[PDB]
Amino acid sequence: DHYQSKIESVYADPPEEWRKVIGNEFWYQYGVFDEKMDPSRLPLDASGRRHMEYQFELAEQAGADLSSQSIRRAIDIGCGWGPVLSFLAERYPHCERIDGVNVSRPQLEYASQVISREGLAARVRLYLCNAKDIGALPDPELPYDLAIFRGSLFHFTPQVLQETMQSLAQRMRPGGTVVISESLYKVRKTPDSLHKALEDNGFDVIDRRITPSNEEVIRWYGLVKDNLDAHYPDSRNPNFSELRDIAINFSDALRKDKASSFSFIARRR
Ligand SMILES: Nc1ncnc2c1ncn2[C@@H]1O[C@H](CSCC[C@H](N)C(=O)O)[C@@H](O)[C@H]1O
Ligand SMILES: CC1=C(C)[C@@](C)(CC/C(C)=C/COP(=O)(O)OP(=O)(O)O)[C@H](C)[C@H]1C
């Protein structure tokens, strides 16, 4: 993968710096802003966690096997700073093995400290590994029950996507659940291109909808940009600048309804 070096370097700044920008829980793929969002926590932390929850409610409603004794091994593909690793360990205390995979070393070092200081090292495993290489993860005899792609697919070429889905198919039992959040154009990736790549690789889409709303995602980018303006006004950091560019330019594509955040719940055949 020739685009990995560019992905690694864009998430390379200190967690202390990123904390000011996206929240203390480091949720980095939008948020649901409804009556079940916690009003006590930072809007970004509460909405981001509420988005993950809402997606598991959609999955459950769509007929996915997400019961306590159905989830023995989960994988978080492009796990960022690790917010979903902690969330899975709490939602599934009897899940034996939660594997995070990421290409970003600084994200995994932070995730590693959080997992450790909350005594989750027993169950949560962190791998510096391209999503296309998940076929090389340990213990192939123990299949995946659950797979999360929270905002990770944007960074994938068609080839990496293909290889990631091939590899996950081979490592995932029939009926294992795939929970995907991604921003897609409705005219890089579209709903239909992603639907195709899933169905071409042994996955059935059982729920497919806009989530969160364009209104809510615009608001989420709002909160980020306010934090970016207050902490990095003078475009000192080229990575935070590039996030400002995206917050501005994608918010406008969302305003013109040229794109949306999509939830895809799929199921291994
Ligand atoms: N090919 C690849 N293999 C593994 N991780 C990848 C990847 N391409 C992108 N990523 C990771 O995908 C993540 C996307 S950002 C989203 C982070 C996290 N899922 C969250 O929701 O908070 C980044 O951490 C990036 O390093
Ligand atoms: C987890 C996240 C993601 C998966 C991100 C990337 C959302 C996907 C987006 C907007 C990628 C930006 O694409 P691009 O640079 O082409 O934007 P344009 O110039 O409008 O075309 C967020 C940074 C973050 C919340």
Q: What is the DSSP string of the chain?
A: -TTHHHHHHHT-S-HHHHHHHH-SS---S----STTS-SSS-HHHHHHHHHHHHHHHHHHHTT---STTT-SEEEEET-TTSHHHHHHHHH-TT--EEEEEES-HHHHHHHHHHHHHTT-TTTEEEEE--GGGGGGSS-TTS-EEEEEEES-GGG--HHHHHHHHHHHHHHEEEEEEEEEEEEEE-----HHHHHHHHHTTTEEEEEEEE-S-HHHHHHHHHHHHHHHHHH-TT--SHHHHHHHHHHHHHHHHHHTTSEEEEEEEEEE-
Chain center to CA of 151: 4
The resolution in angstroms reads 2.6
Q: Answer yes or no: is the C-beta of 250 below 6 A from any ligand 2 atom.
A: yes
Closest CA to 126 of 91, 94, 97, 90: 97
CA distance 146 to 121: 19
Please name which of 136, 139, 130, 84 lies closest in space to residue 105, comparing C-alpha atoms: 130
Residues forming beta bridges with residue 98, ordered by sequence position: 74, 124
How far apart CA 87 and CA 118 sit, in angstroms, is 12
Across-strand partners of 74? 98, 146
The whole-angstrom separation of Cα 145 and Cα 92 is: 12
Euclidean distance between CA atoms 243 and 224, whole angstroms: 9
Phi, psi of 234 (to 5 degrees): -90, 25
* Experiment type: X-ray
What distance in Å separates the CA atoms of residue 230 and residue 224, rounded to the nearest whole number? 10
- 255, amino acid identity: R
* Candidate from 184, 250, 252, 255 with most ligand 2 atoms within 8 A of CB, to mutate: 250
Q: In what order do the strands lie in the sheet with 73-77?
A: 124-128, 97-102, 73-77, 144-150, 172-185, 259-268, 203-210
The dihedral through the CA atoms of 20, 23, 26, 31 has a sign that is: negative
Measured in Å, residue 68 CA sits from the centre of ligand 2 at 34
Does the beta carbon of 127 lie inside 6 Å of ligand 2?
no
How far away, in angstroms, is 80 Cα from ligand 1 center? 5
Atom of ligand 1 nearest to the CA of 130: 3
Angle of the 214-231 helix axis to the 43-61 helix axis, nearest 10: 150
Q: Is 47 exposed, middle or buried (0-12, 13-18, 19+ CB in 10 A)?
A: buried
Sign of CA dihedral 230, 233, 236, 242: positive
Question: Beta strands 172-185 and 124-128: pairing type?
Answer: unpaired
Residue 218 and residue 251 in contact, taking contact as beta carbons nearer than 8 Å: yes
Domains observed in the chain = 4-268 (3.40.50.150)
Cα angle: 231, vertex 106, 189; to 5 degrees: 80
142: number of Cβ within 10 Å: 14
HSE toward the beta carbon, residue 206, CA cutoff 13 A: 23
Index of the ligand 1 atom closest to the CA of residue 148: 19
151 CA closest ligand 2 atom index = 4
Q: Which ligand is nearest to the CA of 87?
A: 1
Instruction: State the amino acid at position 247 in one-letter form.
Output: A
Q: Could you say which ligand is closest to the alpha carbon of residue 151?
A: 2
